Amino acid sequence: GKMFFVDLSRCTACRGCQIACKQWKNLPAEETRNTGSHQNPPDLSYVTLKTVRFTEKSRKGPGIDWLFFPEQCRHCVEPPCKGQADVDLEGAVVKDETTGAVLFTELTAKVDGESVRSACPYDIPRIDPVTKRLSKCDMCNDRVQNGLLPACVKTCPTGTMNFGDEQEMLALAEKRLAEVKKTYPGAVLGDPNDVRVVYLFTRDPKDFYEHAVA
């Protein structure tokens, strides 16, 4: 299938990915406030499939380690979200066989929304207060099937976002992990064997976000 390699050691937190995701699906803007952070929206929601999380970490010397985490569904090889939802209706959550995309269908209005979120070890699924539909990164499955890159991957100017065949993206992740380690010696690949969104973290993934790894 297909795979994302997210080299977080190249992220400028431009938030091109965040805007590009919404422009492609024509999703509506949330009502946001500044509460002493650049991060907005604060969390994922029904209308936000991806938000960039900002974390400041102290370091001796001048400046900080500014951690940027563009969060999306991991599109897991064995999705906990599916297994959970298939106890109510086998179809609400399906895996595309060709891409590997874990897709929530319209039948998620029937399943228990809060229960499919809890099953998720990355806390990705979000309910519509009205519809009761689960929504998240759909992998831009539309575009991938038609030979186009995902909107977030195309828009990314740093080479943080990569997408391709899982053989090629594994190869790039191993190669890049080795090179990045030379500057950030505690750099690790997020759940390489479980997920199709392989994040390269520069340090302890929990610093980027509490649910950055399973």
Binding site: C14, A20, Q23, S37
Partner: protein
Amino acid sequence: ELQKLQWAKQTTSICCYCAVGCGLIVHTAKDGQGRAVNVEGDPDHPINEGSLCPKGASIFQLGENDQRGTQPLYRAPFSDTWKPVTWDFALTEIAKRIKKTRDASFTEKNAAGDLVNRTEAIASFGSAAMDNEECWAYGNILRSLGLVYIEHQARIXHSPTVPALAESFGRGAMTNHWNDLANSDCILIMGSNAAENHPIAFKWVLRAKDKGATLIHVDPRFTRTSARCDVYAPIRSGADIPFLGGLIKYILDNKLYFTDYVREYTNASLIVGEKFSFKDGLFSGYDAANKKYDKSMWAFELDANGVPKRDPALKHPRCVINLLKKHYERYNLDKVAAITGTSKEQLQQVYKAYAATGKPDKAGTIMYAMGWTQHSVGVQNIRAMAMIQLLLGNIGVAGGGVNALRGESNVQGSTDQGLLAHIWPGYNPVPNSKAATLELYNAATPQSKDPMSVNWWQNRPKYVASYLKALYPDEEPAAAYDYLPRIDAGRKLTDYFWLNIFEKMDKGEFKGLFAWGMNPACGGANANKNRKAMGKLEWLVNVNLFENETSSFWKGPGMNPAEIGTEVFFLPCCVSIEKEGSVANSGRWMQWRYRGPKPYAETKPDGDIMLDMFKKVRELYAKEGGAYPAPIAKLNIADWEEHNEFSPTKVAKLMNGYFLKDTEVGGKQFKKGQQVPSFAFLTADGSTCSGNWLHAGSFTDAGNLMARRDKTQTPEQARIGLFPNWSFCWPVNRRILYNRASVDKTGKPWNPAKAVIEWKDGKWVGDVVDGGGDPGTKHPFIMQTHGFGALYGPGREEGPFPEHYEPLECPVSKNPFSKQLHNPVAKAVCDPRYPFIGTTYRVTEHWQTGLMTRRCAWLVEAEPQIFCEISKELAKLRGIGNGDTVKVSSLRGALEAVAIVTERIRPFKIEGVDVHMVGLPWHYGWMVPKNGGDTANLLTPSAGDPNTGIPETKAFMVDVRKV
């Protein structure tokens, strides 16, 4: 297929925001007829390869916006409401206001009795947001109407660069281009936040890093740029010259300069006169009365023929290089470390990493924008960078250059078209009252007796003639010269500039203002003064995308519409993707873009609004007569339009220029009506026209070169990413300037692995060689009189060498380098109620005053409110918690913002005192959004200086209080 795109026509465009110039693909419904359905990146564009920052990515929400102006609006004097009107009405009643104001205020001769043929009753602002054809046509419309107060964005961010690099290299432009950043071995980012403010630039910066380059960020703040650099060196506000002075001294001490490059291609060897000296912060020839220098005291010792004397041995103690060694002796690590606030360990690290690029086969580049040069010594900051780059042999080479990042998508082009008080198009000066004839104008052109010095500005007469022949083709240039207005040689050049326009306006010395594609009510420093000053205009014309804080100043905060008698015409223009034309990016890439969707509602391109408006004035004079009608009547606007509308294509071809008769020139035959191949084939005799000599070669008989989308490259071109067949750059597709400096005297590159040009059997190969002639026969800086890169630059107001004068007033009382504290050729209260150094800057997600991006839900989503960034130190002092509402106040005004408490801001040690810096975005305004906040320019001073006329928006005194 994708249902969204399936039935839409696909056109290409260029991003309408920053000067990177990223490519878009636009999808428009009804096979081009209807609205846009999708805007994303052009995957074939060589600069961005389909990547877009959030501003570019959200251009769909900019274009297809329900809040966009739909038709011309009218605010009657003392009214509190807009009345919708027709175009026919707006443009006529505007044309009446112009003609009236002109007829009444138009003086043909100044007090001295010298011909001026101008009005000082009308001022224009803008704009770098218009197409290059609109900017040119607009500049010439205003100048036919006899305006002299013609300014835009460039005055603030761009104006310091042009004199600094012009003095140093011969031109004011960014020396290289964006793709070239990838070829650098060390990238020094100082007075730039490029990762946020030129985000696609960071594609190439990180490919520099991929191939072993060190990335250095020198900034008072830890930014998103800092997050991705190998070295972050915190510098306190205004300590840049100390920092660069210490680097110059470090390079000379450790002998890291490129010896051959310096000896051959800089002015290192030139002998300065005995009249030149420097003592305790002052150069020789200082006039304490007029606070000016006698610059003739800084002149070179001239040989028999009048050429500067050279000592190739570099021994003579009045050799530039030896005077340079003497001057920067004072800038030792301990002194520089102390004042910059950068540790001696980290200064050594940055100097070591960067000065290593003095290697012939190592290239170091410097990226700067606006942040650091908002004071009277901005020019000397850039001069210091030019001189470092000359010592290390980094000018002319791949991964080298001075990368003066331009701001707006077409601020390069808007400046090239002369939308500033002091320049016509092609940077030919606006003539003064004492340039009474065209011959006298052409007499002021300096000459050189050096037979190895090309001295290309000698051709000025050909360009000025060709330009007058583009405006007035039925007249002899000598005769045409009398039509266009002139400035008083008496007055100060800064008296016609941005800051003085507000000062004059506030004294009611202006009847009418054009605010054309700008938001001065938020963009102007000291907004309260400016908003009031606008109320003292009779009539105001705002051409823009949305209603805004300028158009609607009369119903602003603490304004009573009733009492305000300003007649306001708001004209809604179409967005970039709704029109055709060219914009020049930072790299001088003149890129063509196409209409996708039809203009939204009754909105028009700017070219149609200005051409129609002028056509109404033209016929108004044909009917009534009035003040000196020749310039308005005789102006060639027939070459601007096809099918009764503005023609980007035709204007572009006029700007390029064509032969007005059968002409023999450069030993070649040309027939009447043929497009000029290049500015090499322009003439002073009136045979040729060309609206902009820099554009000569952009639109030839071969076609529109700006519109080429061709990625064909020879190996040598592809190895450094020249992309010479992708669009076109001035001059004549020279992608890297001063490239003659990238080879030795035999024509071999210093770094063959990253060659720019190379002499291969009879021809220069790779880039277009910047100056014709065989290797070793010509000095590489062709626009320089003497032909050399200027280490010593005696044309500068402040002195021939950069010297630290404190741009801060309040927290400083001791210059540790001289007895001269402040700039001796340039009053601040420093009320102790305002003890913090306030500063303004940008976030990635917003644009300028936010007039555009505050109208875009997704950009507001990410950055919804004006904030105030403070250290953890100042937070605990003022008892301010992260996210708490705060009051930020100065002598000029006050506002509220959300506190961001971060370690990314630190206190500065200034003369053994913790001075706290507070950071504000100037992206906000009262118009939108709800709870967005207002402009940070409520706080800023409108005090500039008599040389640059730039206000200090980067270091101004404020207090910040919890609420």
